[PDB]
Ligand binder design. Sequence first.
Ligand code: DTP
Lengths: 327, 115, 546, 50, 50, 195
Amino acid sequence: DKAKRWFLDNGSIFLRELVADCNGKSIPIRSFSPEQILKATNNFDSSCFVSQDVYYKWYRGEIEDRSYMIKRFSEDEITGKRHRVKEVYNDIVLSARMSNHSNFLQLLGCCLEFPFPVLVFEFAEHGAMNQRGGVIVNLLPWSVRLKIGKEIANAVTYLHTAFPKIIIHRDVKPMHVFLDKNWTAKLSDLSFSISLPEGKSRIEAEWVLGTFGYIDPLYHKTCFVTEYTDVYSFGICLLVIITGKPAIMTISDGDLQGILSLVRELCENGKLDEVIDPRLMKDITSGQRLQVEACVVLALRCCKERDEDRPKMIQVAKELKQIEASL
Amino acid sequence: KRTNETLRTLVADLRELVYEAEDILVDCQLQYKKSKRLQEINERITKIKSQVEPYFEFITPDRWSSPVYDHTQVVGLEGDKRKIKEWLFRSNDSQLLIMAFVGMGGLGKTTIAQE
Amino acid sequence: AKRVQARDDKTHRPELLSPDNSWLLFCNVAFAANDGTCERPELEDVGKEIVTKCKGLPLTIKAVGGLLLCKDHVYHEWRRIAEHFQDELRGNTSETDNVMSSLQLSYDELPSHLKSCILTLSLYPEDCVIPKQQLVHGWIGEGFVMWRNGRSATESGEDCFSGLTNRCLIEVVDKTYSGTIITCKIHDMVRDLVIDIAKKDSFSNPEGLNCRHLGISGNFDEKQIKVNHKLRGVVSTTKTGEVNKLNSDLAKKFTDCKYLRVLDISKSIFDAPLSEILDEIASLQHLACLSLSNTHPLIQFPRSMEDLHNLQILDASYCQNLKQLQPCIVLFKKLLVLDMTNCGSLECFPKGIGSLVKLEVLLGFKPARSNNGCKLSEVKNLTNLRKLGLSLTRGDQIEEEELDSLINLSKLMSISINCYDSYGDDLITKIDALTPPHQLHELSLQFYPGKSSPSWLSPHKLPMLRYMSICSGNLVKMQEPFWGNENTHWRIEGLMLSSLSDLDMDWEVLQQSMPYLRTVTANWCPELESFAIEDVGFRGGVWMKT
Amino acid sequence: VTKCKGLPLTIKAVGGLLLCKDHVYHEWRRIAEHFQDELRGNTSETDNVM
Amino acid sequence: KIQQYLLGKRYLIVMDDVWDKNLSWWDKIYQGLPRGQGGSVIVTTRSESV
Amino acid sequence: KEWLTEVNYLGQLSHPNLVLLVGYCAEGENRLLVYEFMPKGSLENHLFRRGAQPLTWAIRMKVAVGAAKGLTFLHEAKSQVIYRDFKAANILLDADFNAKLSDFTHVSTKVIGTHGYAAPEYVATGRLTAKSDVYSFGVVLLELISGRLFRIMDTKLGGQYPQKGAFTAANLALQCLNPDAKLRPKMSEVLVTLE
Ligand SMILES: Nc1ncnc2c1ncn2[C@H]1C[C@H](O)[C@@H](COP(=O)(O)OP(=O)(O)OP(=O)(O)O)O1
């Protein structure tokens, strides 16, 4: 076959960057077969898909005795660029390196006879979180959502702080977030996370990119990356945790609801009376409204339009931790 | 120590002979080819000995330090000097204070002691 | 320093010079005509570049200033010296200043096996960071290390390595928490010295033909580095991150020697699978070690291994596709090291692993399932090993009455358990049946899907543990025997807790359970916050108590 | 010490070669089984009972 | 000794017939000579290298 | 498929402050749009270059009025054409100092507005409007004022007063740069209030 060719180049490409990343010391990657991925995805044409994006598709699956979560790619996109294929290789290598931290979604191997790789991860029956919530057949209590918030905060601080090179996963969205049986969130899809050089949290980037609303307008009108260019987007994520609403929204209104603008104008004028989650009005919220408005104040504070107005992401996680540690 | 050049060339030649001798010796464990290999390498060893030896028949055949130095070229050692002086001011707190200046060659050990 | 027994904190180690101080010294030596001031400003970049080539030794700086003080300050020979630096400093103006003599008198007072060990380090690039383990397997490979009194391979070569670091000929890059060394580098004047001593007897030519053993730096796919017939060893020296790309025909030349005791292929990509690349490794006979670590096209290592009766070290680590290990390794009974760490796809062994007895290191064991591979029962055979690495995946990997398979291992010093791809809850119950030997110097539970302690980690079950690290996992609390403070205590001297989200223990309770501590390195444990680390959350401290 | 059998000189030689050691149990055990071989190596002939 | 015996004196010293071999002894003793006193060295030699 | 469609999309071009139908190709590949020449380059080839030209008086204000005329050409007369491509490099000049514009769901890589051209609502939502057009035109006016009641925003002439265009332009920019979608400009008032 030509599939042997798919071996003998792709992994070799693969090899010369994880040696460039970890100097070869990594996690026990499993090498699977073609037919097991065609079997567990049921020839990749069913309703076992989790979610989609531009360059990849998240599916469920089941190889023997363990259901898995399988990521695959799109052939025409990555064969139609010749220069942004290094993002796929950065994705597989960084998703290998982050796999030991708990609030990331672990990697359980790689089969790569396919278009370029096809990746496999452990199973999480709570699916990927939607633009407002769970895509289970139906709805989460407030403590569970605040736990999700603090652990996504932990994982992004792990991205920024745990290494001599700061990797800023700028496109944090609830769509990248999975959940366990015990509702422990796990980030994934680091494909656009660029790796700065060391000692320099401020180096001019190459092009502005990524996800309207979560774009961080500061980087959109300055075009150089700092870590705050993630933190802004994080707060909007927390608002989806808070509201139960989509980020970009309309209610018969011109496809125009900047939900950040809505919550700040309901702060300065409406006085925090509509951030009280109509998905979860039936909750107790006796003293929990106190931590709710603390969360809304913090989520506005990290979404502030200037850098110095925004806390460092470590501090964001720390005051999140004190917020849930009040109870 | 204190060796002439003929000894140096002979040592450099005998090392090559040692390597090829224990190279071909491992093939012990027809005998004809191995016996002629043994012949050639034995005769080369004996020939080299015989023609080196009359040159040795023909002819027959220190480092110190002190507390005197210059203290003008001594580029700043005031931190190390300070630390070692506060080590020496604590001499009575032991019975016999012993100290070590450990490093590679030509690093500053004698000069930091002189300082 | 220890033979006089100075103290641990009465030693003093002077550091290499800062570039500003080194420039001051070089002006004070060379430009001594007026004050140590540079009397013309066009020689300054040349002088600063030569000074950066000196790299902080005062002695090389004073030697270079000595040979420039006999010079008329013309730009051209200053440029000349700025490109031909070590050649003039091994001419030493016909041996007057002699950097090389003062370093070589620290060379030549070595035992001759340490001479042969230190000479192989002349086969590396400029300032690459060299792994310790590869040097040790190289030294055991040519037989630069001998042994009789039990201390067979790894401790003997490690004693050789520590003997070289004690002579200040080798600088240690970074330790671990347990004090052990992983990576190594040498100063560049010492590198030139050991090259020039290799530029004698035909150890390393490194150009041309006559070479006893060669090393391959990066990308000889288009250079055609030349291999003659002698070649006692071939190692691959890569400067920490790039991959030495190798052509297929050169790998065909590697099977064409007859006297090749060391062959390791480490940062490499080949044009073909390594099965048919190395079909004729039967033609290699006296081969001691193979480190086929981190090479892409290796699905299956070649079948013709049965004509390898010596084979003291077999390393294939970190190659994520090593499916079927071959039963022909059960034949020859004379290896020392079998090292499969993090080899993901691997069906868990041939049968007679407990047959061959002389081996000391067994990493990434993967005990078999029910009617498969090999179990833990014959590991009880191996009364000479001292480093063992497990990697458990599910419950029927192990079996209950093989729980006595680790009690009688007398000489054992270390256990690493890697429960990464862990599924079964019964495994958590089946791991608790295992007991380590009561002598055990250091263990590492690095994934461990349990919630409480493993219910043997007590000072009762293992009194002499000194080092202990717990990496990632889903652990919650430690059980009651883990404290055990009626009369027993741990005497664990160093401790590491890497990424444990749910771990709950208390600081002064640890101190009243662990009286003899030096350092505790925790860095991702957001539950704790009671420690003396600057944050047990998002970064790490060490807590050196004094 | 019972392997030394009352000579002060062998005791001081064994204590001399153990004083250059980091008190790990394993090599102390090692010396407790390979006793005369290390004392005829004499740390490459330094203490030299023999 | 020579630091003491030459200290605070106006010393003249004649190094006669100095050759261009192993001349490093010069700057082993050049720091042994006190400075700022008027001391003078006269080296007579067959080399303007030295 | 690709021919009668693109001629219908490109045939509607008859406006003085734009580029007309000069030429095209046979374009088996992507866009080989051939539209000939602009002699003196762009605004940034005269504003943000220290090589050629210092300031003048309000002829660039006539350039901005002519480009605002071009806005009112494509927003009012044609029912649906949106520029989306406001740059000072897209604004091109003649010897007559006149503006001629050329060089034309959620997709990752952003191109529009590497600097403050893009609207904050287009940032937060991606709605792709004429409100972004008038906000971008307001900040182009700010670039004309800047070069980078005490309004000495110029660094080369401290005599902004006698035509009073500086105060009016700054106050219309205070009207343009308000963040919502409710106080928005309309371009004919920007035409009549800057002449
Ligand atoms: N800080 C310094 N400033 C100026 N010269 C220095 C400095 N440190 C060392 N030197 C010079 C003095 C000598 O000319 C040269 C060698 O240093 P020195 O102290 O004699 O060697 P060392 O004691 O480090 O090792 P060894 O005695 O084994 O050669 O370096």
